[PDB]
Amino acid sequence: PLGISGTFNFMIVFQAEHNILMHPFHQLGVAGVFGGALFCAMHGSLVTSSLIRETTETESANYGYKFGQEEETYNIVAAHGYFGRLIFQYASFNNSRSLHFFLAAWPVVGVWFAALGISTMAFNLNGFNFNHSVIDAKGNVINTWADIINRANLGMEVMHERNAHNFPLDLA
Amino acid sequence: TITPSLKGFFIGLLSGAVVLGLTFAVLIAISQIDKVQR
Amino acid sequence: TTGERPFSDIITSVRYWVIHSITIPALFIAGWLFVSTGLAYDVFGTPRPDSYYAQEQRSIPLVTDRFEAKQQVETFLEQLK
Amino acid sequence: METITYVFIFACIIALFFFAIFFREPPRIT
Amino acid sequence: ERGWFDILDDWLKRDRFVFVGWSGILLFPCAYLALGGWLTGTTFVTSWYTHGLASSYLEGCNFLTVAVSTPANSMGHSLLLLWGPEAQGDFTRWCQLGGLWTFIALHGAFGLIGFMLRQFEIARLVGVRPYNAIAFSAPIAVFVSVFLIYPLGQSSWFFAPSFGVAAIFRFLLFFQGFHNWTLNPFHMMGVAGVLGGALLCAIHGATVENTLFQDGEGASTFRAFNPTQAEETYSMVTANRFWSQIFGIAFSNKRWLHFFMLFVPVTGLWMSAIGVVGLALNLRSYDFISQEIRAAEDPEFETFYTKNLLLNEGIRAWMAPQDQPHENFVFPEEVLPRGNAL
Amino acid sequence: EPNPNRQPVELNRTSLYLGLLLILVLALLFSSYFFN
Amino acid sequence: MEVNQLGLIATALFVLVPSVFLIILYVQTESQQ
Amino acid sequence: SEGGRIPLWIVATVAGMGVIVIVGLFFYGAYAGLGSSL
Amino acid sequence: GLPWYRVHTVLINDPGRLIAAHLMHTALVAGWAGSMALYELATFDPSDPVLNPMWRQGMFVLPFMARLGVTGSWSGWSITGETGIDPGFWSFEGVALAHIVLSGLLFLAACWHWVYWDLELFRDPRTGEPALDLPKMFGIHLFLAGLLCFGFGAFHLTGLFGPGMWVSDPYGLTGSVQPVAPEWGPDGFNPYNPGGVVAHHIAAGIVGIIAGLFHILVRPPQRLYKALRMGNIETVLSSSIAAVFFAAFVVAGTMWYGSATTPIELFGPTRYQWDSSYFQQEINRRVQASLASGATLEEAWSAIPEKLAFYDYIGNNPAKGGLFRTGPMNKGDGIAQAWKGHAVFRNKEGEELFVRRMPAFFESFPVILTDKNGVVKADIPFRRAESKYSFEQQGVTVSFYGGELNGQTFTDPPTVKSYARKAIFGEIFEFDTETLNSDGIFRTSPRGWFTFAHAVFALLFFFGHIWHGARTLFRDVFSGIDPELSPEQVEWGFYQKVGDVTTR
Amino acid sequence: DWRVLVVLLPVLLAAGWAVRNILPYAVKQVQKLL
Amino acid sequence: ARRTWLGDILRPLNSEYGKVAPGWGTTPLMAVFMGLFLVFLLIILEIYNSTLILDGVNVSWKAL
Amino acid sequence: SYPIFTVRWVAVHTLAVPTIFFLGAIAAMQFIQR
Ligand code: CLA
Ligand code: CLA
Ligand code: CLA
Ligand SMILES: C=Cc1c(C)c2cc3nc(c4c5[nH]c(cc6nc(cc1[nH]2)C(C)=C6CC)c(C)c5C(=O)[C@@H]4C(=O)OC)[C@@H](CCC(=O)OC/C=C(\C)CCC[C@H](C)CCC[C@H](C)CCCC(C)C)[C@@H]3C
Ligand SMILES: CC(C)=CCC/C(C)=C/CC/C(C)=C/CC/C(C)=C/CC/C(C)=C/CC/C(C)=C/CC/C(C)=C/CC/C(C)=C/CC/C(C)=C/CC1=CC(=O)C(C)=C(C)C1=O
Ligand SMILES: CCCCCCCCCCCCCCCC(=O)OC[C@H](COP(=O)(O)OC[C@@H](O)CO)OC(=O)CCCCCCCCCCCCCCC
Ligand SMILES: CC1=C(/C=C/C(C)=C/C=C/C(C)=C/C=C/C=C(C)/C=C/C=C(C)/C=C/C2=C(C)CCCC2(C)C)C(C)(C)CCC1
Ligand SMILES: CC1=C(/C=C/C(C)=C/C=C/C(C)=C/C=C/C=C(C)/C=C/C=C(C)/C=C/C2=C(C)CCCC2(C)C)C(C)(C)CCC1
Ligand SMILES: CCCCCCCCCCCCO[C@@H]1O[C@H](CO)[C@@H](O[C@H]2O[C@H](CO)[C@@H](O)[C@H](O)[C@H]2O)[C@H](O)[C@H]1O
Ligand SMILES: CCCCCCCS[C@@H]1O[C@H](CO)[C@@H](O)[C@H](O)[C@H]1O
Ligand SMILES: [Ca+2]
Ligand SMILES: [Cl-]
Ligand SMILES: [Cl-]
Ligand SMILES: [Fe+2]
Ligand SMILES: [Mg+2]
């Protein structure tokens, strides 16, 4: 639906019918956007951390950059020197071109997988199903967290579109 | 009265003191052996 | 560079692999035996497939007291015959 | 009342888009 | 004065492969124990006595279903120290009672403090501004609000998130059914900050890579960059014109752009943390009172708001008995809410 | 007796647009909850 | 609909007071030399 | 002794294959024994 | 010019105008307290301290005046229900008036200190530059704080020269303001021992007196002065903010869990007294004692105080509210008028059944009735076509003991189901829902609102400490990094010790 | 408990085998740092 | 700068800007009090938490 | 030329030693039957 609560309705019913949280493509999608936001604050904080001093303390440091200037406005070597020591040297970029490529590629690829998760659950290839996967020696079902997810999904399934189903299986 | 949990409290205090003590003991030792050149 | 020997140097050296062709399988086998002897179950208190329930009961042995929790589990463990 | 409020706020935002695009500070190279 | 303190300081701050520092005394044990406790628990430890769940590789769970689960609700907010009055020094009992959960959460909290002190420490030695540390306050606000404040407002640690993939998914669905958390405007702001952060990440990366100056002859453009070159490697002017004509507006100040990239995800995480602080007290954005008054009186009035509450009602009734075993909910079939046929 | 610590204050035009957009969007978000 | 009627003045002051603040600062920046 | 003897590409290949062996064993386990639902 | 988010930095080097700004802030806060108390006095209903106490009415500052001994009005009532009292000047109105007058005096002082900012006192006698000796200021202010802390505990709380503080029984039935003696044993550290509160202020006050004298007489070590930048006033802001968010988390926790300084008659019950059926257990015990002593069911329950029954109701649980459900609790379920009495349910066999109470987590809850062994005996079904436990099938009736419905029994299914729906909330009350146009949806109490605001503020002030601490320790690079930063300082190996050029 | 000895024994032999192959250089490294 | 009667009285109290004690001074004594304070906070925390249970200290409203 | 026992050596092995032990434990679990 084209609305805010209609979006939530779509997401809730999607979980009931395809177990999207347990699909690896939605999981890659979450890595895409959690990673994208991490690297966004990351790149933002490093570049801001190594701005070359060009201003007094009473002005915004943003005036130290002039639109169209030829020279870079921060010291990438100092940024590399800080972040390489935060982790280790070879976990830090020193090539700005490949750094900015990684920034481009990580969220874009993750969101491609997210879109492909929706597109392939459209044809009912659903998330992993571990309902009653763990069985004891006698054959008692031992519940896992997957079975608790299933209980929540059953509640969404039995209430959604409450007047729309006449037959026991909600096949589409 | 020293309840079981107050005894347990003292055991926690001693354990952590021992852990911090050996850690700094080892660290001071090594820093004295491998000094920087100035 | 920070002075330590490069990793590519070390892992292509015969001496590295003489040492680690023993230490790596030995650790792997120690891990296997920790499970195969059943010792993992008893260190951590994890049920075996035959010790989740008593033969005819279907109720969880759920801890319900804070300061007698240790005795409750011990009581649950007795009732497995 | 509440419908008027929602639409009024919305309409202000569309007006703000107009001024931000066409009456922006021009970027000037130096 | 070059006493023992200054000599220790010398050794802690040596330029080695893994920088240590004074912060490392806190950071390294706590991070290592939090990670070691999570791998130990997910590999070997059960949740049978606290939740009625299997939860380790040893019991047959896989990477998606293992967890270190929260303690039993009867533990309250107990620290669950190994030497405390519940486990009484018994390591095995401690594991069965959920002691690994507070172990991970508390060593994790102090490890995160240590990582932020490390960001400050290294920044001061290299001589950079400490904005990376300031940005890391947002992950700390999230961890503290979700894993500590939220259960502390509730009845016990049991209702905190458990440390596992599927256990966290259960946590998301619990928050929809019980708190209607999608409706909460503080979550909404968090979503905007996370998705806007992902967007800024993709667009700035793609913009740099497609306004590059030709500074080499190869078809691979990565080599045509030198870390000490003084020139911008891409054209801010061409980038500005492209977006002005595609989108209407564009960045013109490269320093503002990169501060904005800090600002947006960090502010978003901070807002979501505030809303979870409210959920600790059940101070939810659950309802719109005006919608409920109309719907109570007018059985033809239906919106997507009212549709979603019915879904929440299903979640609560169908998941509560298994999800809250200490409550001993017995809900006969005839009281379960269900639509027609299903 | 003029105080030497006075300083002029600035708000440029892009900051005004940014600020107004933030306030209007926050109002558009929170108004529904104010009316409830 | 039975909305809270304070919602109106709450929304109006929410927009107006900070918007007016920003306009004062901007206009007196333009009027500087 | 001296680093250089065993070529890195052979180290990489042998290590890669051990990863594939151990990960295949875990996927095998999803269909047998505990957690197989059988 | 200055960006908008920096306008207040013009005070950093101007102690006189800093004092003026701090005077103006104090005047605003004092005026808020006076005007909030007047608004509360104009809306407060004092006529029923049993079923309409202040915490049902959205009162936020009234409980704080009552906590320390202000309990009466010049118009002749008190919050404990007495009439014809004379509180003297320090009534609720006299306290509000005093805060208003203080606000105006501080406003005038702020104007003086703003105009006459160039006072010789603020200049360093050797250099003539503006300068504040922060280390000696700390010992002076800590010394004054210690004296005030000590006098608060020794004179006000003890009743030596002062009214004492609010104290009550474990069930919040008989609270009043009482002089309180210090507890000097280990129970003084029990949060529920009011005696520990007195002891704390006497003992910590003395310690602060001593520590204050120390900090006046002993200068800081050179090593701590450089490391903490004790010449930079912004280091005081950073550590002051850290102490303040520490305190804010503590008062949020003690408000939520309860303590001797957050009594239930002033702020309402806690959520945990519902979780653990704290009041329901006490009610049952009293009914047993009567039943064991020969009284009838009707006499046992009619002897239960209405105030105690009202605590055993989920509508007074502060974990039942909503973020945008505004106003007093009375705006939700109504103004409580009377206990209806204890509902006893029975089936056709005459077995007693017990309604399963609503846990605080659930906005809604099904209606389920068990026998004493927790076996389901009756419910309100959703799908009727395979109901086996309906009230109709099981012949469920309800009888009331105590309260206004005492001695009555109802047998028609619709009326019985009506009271069973109410019984999931605990004891059942009659409410006036018309006076306030109450909407029937639960709101939280001042305990809930206090806790939420202070946890949120505590968390945000953590960011303030990080920000101002960063600005203190990194002042030299606030505008940017050195334009001549040598690549050797940041590349690996050149120095043995990171950032130390003497270790090349 | 014999299973404790069964588990630690492969680890103990691995410690002693690595010490055999490294002790000449180990003593040489400790000597240089003195 | 403007002199006042009250300013003259308080002058000695704002005259030692920047005066320090050599070296580490009283730092080691400060560290002792910090560590004692840490154990104090731990005691009162664990009592409230019921991790530390003492005789005759009943952490409950039932202590009035 | 290079040392053998450094901080890097310790950091590597505190991670790598338990990892291998755990991998052998989890490998053995793939043959447990109920
Ligand atoms: C160095 C970093 C570090 C930090 C910050 C922590 C922090 C913590 N640990 Mg962890 N731990 C660590 C390293 C660390 N640990 C290491 C290296 C190990 C491996 C041995 C462990 C193994 C471990 C276990 C098994 C447990 C913890 C637990 C805890 C928690 C409770 C600690 C406590 O109460 O001690 C209190 C002790 C102190 C504060 C020591 C201070 C001593 C003072 C300053 C000096 C005065 C003492 C005096 C000299 C002695 C008087 C005694 C006398 C009166 C008898 C706390 C989160 C517990 C937990 O997680 O609960 C779930 C727990 O059960 N830790
Ligand atoms: C610690 C602060 C505090 C607390 C805990 C209380 C508590 C209370 N007040 Mg009081 N009050 C306060 C301060 C406080 N007050 C102040 C400063 C004033 C002067 C304005 C008042 C004036 C006042 C009046 C006039 C009334 C109350 C009433 C009440 C009661 C009902 C509360 C309610 O419905 O709130 C509802 C709370 C909300 C709807 C929360 C709002 C959340 C905000 C809007 C979020 C803003 C988001 C922001 C824009 C995001 C920025 C993002 C950006 C950074 C990017 C409750 C007992 C009422 C009462 O019952 O009296 C008997 C009443 O009539 N108060
Ligand atoms: C005792 C508390 C205290 C004091 C005396 C100061 C003082 C200062 N702050 Mg700090 N700060 C604090 C707490 C404090 N701060 C807290 C809790 C935070 C986290 C939110 C911060 C985060 C912070 C940042 C990010 C910055 C400062 C900056 C500053 C400096 C300039 C501020 C300015 O001109 O704002 C002008 C503000 C306005 C003109 C309008 C702001 C209106 C706000 C957002 C909403 C209205 C609030 C309402 C009126 C009052 C609510 C009170 C609340 C406590 C309930 C000044 C030294 C700035 C600086 O470092 O300059 C170099 C700066 O960038 N502060
Ligand atoms: C789930 C999402 C998520 C993860 C997994 C994550 C992870 C990380 N973020 C880091 C950094 C950052 N994240 C940042 C902004 C963000 N980060 C984001 C969200 C995430 N960030 C988002 C959305 C933002 C936008 C604001 C910044 C600005 C930084 C950094 O500067 C820092 C970095 O260096 O990045 C490259 C690194 C800190 C390393 C460390 O603390 O070591 C120490 C390890 C410790 C202290 C152990 C912590 C223990 C934790 C708290 C509990 C235990 C967890 C278990 C072991 C595992 C549980 C797994 C189950 C839940 C499935 C680490 C890679
Ligand atoms: C008893 C005990 C233990 C006592 C200890 C006491 C003591 C003294 C100990 C010291 C001894 C010691 C070292 C012990 C070690 C023990 C031990 C092993 C501890 C380990 C703890 C541990 C494993 C922690 C794990 C932490 C962890 C998971 C880190 C992950 C890091 C990681 C995945 C990084 C990859 C992410 C990455 C490369 C992101 C970059 C993407 C990005 C956009 C970057 C932005 C960016 C990059 C640039 O590059 C530059 C340029 C700019 C512009 C820029 O935008
Ligand atoms: C080669 C296979 C790639 C498949 C996916 C595509 C990834 C790259 C597309 C991202 C678009 C971002 C916006 C444009 C950003 C942009 O402008 O790109 C610019 C960047 C450099 O451009 P150049 O012109 O220098 O080089 C590209 C061509 O011109 C040939 O040199 O492009 C590349 O680096 C191509 C990389 C190909 C090899 C990448 C392989 C990656 C596979 C990694 C495995 C992923 C599996 C994940 C499992 C979870
Ligand atoms: C808790 C505790 C403790 C500790 C312990 C520890 C510290 C441990 C450690 C542990 C550890 C440290 C472990 C480890 C493990 C590891 C593992 C288990 C791994 C695995 C891996 C894998 C399986 C992989 C996979 C993959 C991926 C992920 C991607 C790439 C590809 C591949 C496929 C390769 C103590 C005693 C103190 C005390 C008590 C408690
Ligand atoms: C001059 C004078 C006088 C007078 C005075 C007066 C009359 C005063 C008044 C005063 C006042 C009358 C004051 C008031 C104040 C108030 C305030 C200051 C408030 C504030 C508020 C706020 C700040 C809020 C906020 C918020 C909101 C709005 C929403 C929600 C959230 C929050 C809470 C954030 C006299 C005769 C005495 C004498 C001398 C002279
Ligand atoms: C109801 C909501 C209302 C919110 C209230 C908002 C109040 C905000 C007040 C903003 C006041 C700004 O204060 C204003 O600052 C400017 C510079 O910035 C000062 O201006 C000064 O500097 C400028 C700039 O060189 C000189 O040209 C000028 O001659 C000098 O006076 C003004 O003398 C002062 O009037
Ligand atoms: C069918 C209505 C008559 C049966 C008794 C109803 C339960 S009791 C009823 O509950 C109302 C809230 O719903 C209160 O406002 C009112 O005071 C009270 O009498
Ligand atoms: Ca079998
Ligand atoms: Cl639906
Ligand atoms: Cl159908
Ligand atoms: Fe960039
Ligand atoms: Mg298997």
Tab-separated table of N, CA, C and O and ligand atoms in Angstrom, chain A residues 28 100-101 104-105 108-109 112-113, chain E residues 202 205-206 209-210 212 218-222, ligand 6:
chain	number	residue	atom	x	y	z
A	28	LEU	N	21.103	-10.600	3.998
A	28	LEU	CA	22.091	-9.819	3.259
A	28	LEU	C	21.628	-8.376	3.086
A	28	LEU	O	22.440	-7.443	3.146
A	100	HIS	N	36.178	4.721	-1.847
A	100	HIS	CA	34.878	5.175	-2.323
A	100	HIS	C	34.174	4.130	-3.176
A	100	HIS	O	32.947	4.170	-3.270
A	101	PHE	N	34.910	3.193	-3.784
A	101	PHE	CA	34.252	2.098	-4.493
A	101	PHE	C	33.577	1.150	-3.514
A	101	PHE	O	32.461	0.684	-3.765
A	104	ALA	N	30.423	2.558	-2.368
A	104	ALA	CA	29.369	2.392	-3.365
A	104	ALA	C	28.838	0.967	-3.371
A	104	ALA	O	27.622	0.749	-3.367
A	105	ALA	N	29.743	-0.020	-3.364
A	105	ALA	CA	29.377	-1.400	-3.661
A	105	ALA	C	28.636	-2.077	-2.510
A	105	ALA	O	27.733	-2.887	-2.748
A	108	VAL	N	24.817	-1.119	-2.212
A	108	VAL	CA	24.129	-1.414	-3.467
A	108	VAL	C	23.952	-2.921	-3.634
A	108	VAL	O	22.852	-3.402	-3.930
A	109	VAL	N	25.020	-3.695	-3.409
A	109	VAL	CA	24.908	-5.149	-3.545
A	109	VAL	C	23.949	-5.725	-2.503
A	109	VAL	O	23.183	-6.652	-2.790
A	112	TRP	N	20.439	-5.029	-3.666
A	112	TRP	CA	20.116	-5.955	-4.755
A	112	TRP	C	19.619	-7.290	-4.208
A	112	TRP	O	18.616	-7.828	-4.682
A	113	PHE	N	20.307	-7.837	-3.204
A	113	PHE	CA	19.864	-9.104	-2.623
A	113	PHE	C	18.525	-8.949	-1.922
A	113	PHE	O	17.662	-9.824	-2.037
E	202	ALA	N	25.951	4.965	-0.512
E	202	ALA	CA	25.960	4.493	-1.892
E	202	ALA	C	26.148	5.641	-2.873
E	202	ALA	O	26.887	5.515	-3.854
E	205	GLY	N	29.820	7.310	-2.669
E	205	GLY	CA	30.742	6.375	-3.297
E	205	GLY	C	30.577	6.304	-4.805
E	205	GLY	O	31.555	6.373	-5.552
E	206	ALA	N	29.336	6.182	-5.275
E	206	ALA	CA	29.097	6.123	-6.714
E	206	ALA	C	29.458	7.437	-7.403
E	206	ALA	O	29.942	7.425	-8.542
E	209	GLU	N	33.376	7.762	-7.740
E	209	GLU	CA	33.863	6.831	-8.748
E	209	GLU	C	33.458	7.207	-10.171
E	209	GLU	O	34.041	6.682	-11.126
E	210	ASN	N	32.488	8.097	-10.348
E	210	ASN	CA	32.028	8.456	-11.684
E	210	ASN	C	32.258	9.924	-12.018
E	210	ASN	O	31.738	10.411	-13.032
E	212	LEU	N	35.687	10.841	-11.506
E	212	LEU	CA	37.135	10.719	-11.386
E	212	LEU	C	37.861	11.509	-12.471
E	212	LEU	O	37.420	11.570	-13.623
E	218	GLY	N	45.654	3.379	-17.586
E	218	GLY	CA	45.021	2.071	-17.531
E	218	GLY	C	43.506	2.150	-17.439
E	218	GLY	O	42.930	3.128	-16.958
E	219	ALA	N	42.851	1.089	-17.920
E	219	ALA	CA	41.398	0.982	-17.809
E	219	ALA	C	40.952	0.716	-16.370
E	219	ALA	O	39.793	0.986	-16.030
E	220	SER	N	41.857	0.237	-15.505
E	220	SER	CA	41.623	0.193	-14.063
E	220	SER	C	42.047	1.525	-13.459
E	220	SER	O	43.237	1.864	-13.448
E	221	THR	N	41.082	2.264	-12.928
E	221	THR	CA	41.328	3.623	-12.476
E	221	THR	C	41.865	3.698	-11.050
E	221	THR	O	42.230	4.789	-10.604
E	222	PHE	N	41.944	2.570	-10.340
E	222	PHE	CA	42.396	2.583	-8.951
E	222	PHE	C	43.863	2.986	-8.833
E	222	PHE	O	44.249	3.657	-7.870
M	6	LIG	C1	32.667	-8.821	-11.357
M	6	LIG	C2	31.466	-9.365	-10.607
M	6	LIG	C3	30.692	-8.248	-9.917
M	6	LIG	C4	29.249	-8.649	-9.604
M	6	LIG	C5	28.525	-7.612	-8.746
M	6	LIG	C6	28.893	-6.182	-9.146
M	6	LIG	C7	29.776	-5.491	-8.110
M	6	LIG	C8	30.168	-4.110	-8.609
M	6	LIG	C9	28.926	-3.279	-8.894
M	6	LIG	C10	28.653	-2.270	-7.781
M	6	LIG	C11	28.000	-1.005	-8.351
M	6	LIG	C12	28.249	0.205	-7.454
M	6	LIG	C13	28.091	1.533	-8.194
M	6	LIG	C14	29.166	1.778	-9.254
M	6	LIG	C15	30.542	2.026	-8.643
M	6	LIG	C16	31.569	2.280	-9.728
M	6	LIG	O1	31.555	3.284	-10.417
M	6	LIG	O2	32.607	1.313	-9.995
M	6	LIG	C17	33.889	1.792	-10.378
M	6	LIG	C18	34.881	0.642	-10.234
M	6	LIG	C19	36.196	1.001	-10.932
M	6	LIG	O3	35.940	1.350	-12.293
M	6	LIG	P1	37.086	1.209	-13.423
M	6	LIG	O4	36.638	1.876	-14.697
M	6	LIG	O5	38.372	1.591	-12.738
M	6	LIG	O6	37.060	-0.385	-13.695
M	6	LIG	C20	35.890	-1.028	-14.211
M	6	LIG	C21	36.038	-1.252	-15.715
M	6	LIG	O7	36.247	0.021	-16.332
M	6	LIG	C22	37.210	-2.183	-16.046
M	6	LIG	O8	38.439	-1.668	-15.510
M	6	LIG	O9	34.270	-0.520	-10.804
M	6	LIG	C23	34.829	-1.775	-10.329
M	6	LIG	O10	35.651	-1.773	-9.422
M	6	LIG	C24	34.398	-3.058	-10.985
M	6	LIG	C25	34.740	-4.224	-10.076
M	6	LIG	C26	34.545	-5.540	-10.814
M	6	LIG	C27	34.961	-6.706	-9.928
M	6	LIG	C28	34.155	-6.678	-8.635
M	6	LIG	C29	33.841	-8.089	-8.154
M	6	LIG	C30	33.085	-8.059	-6.829
M	6	LIG	C31	32.556	-9.444	-6.473
M	6	LIG	C32	32.676	-9.682	-4.973
M	6	LIG	C33	31.863	-10.892	-4.526
M	6	LIG	C34	30.458	-10.477	-4.106
M	6	LIG	C35	29.695	-11.656	-3.513
M	6	LIG	C36	28.914	-11.211	-2.284
M	6	LIG	C37	28.315	-12.399	-1.543
M	6	LIG	C38	27.623	-11.938	-0.279
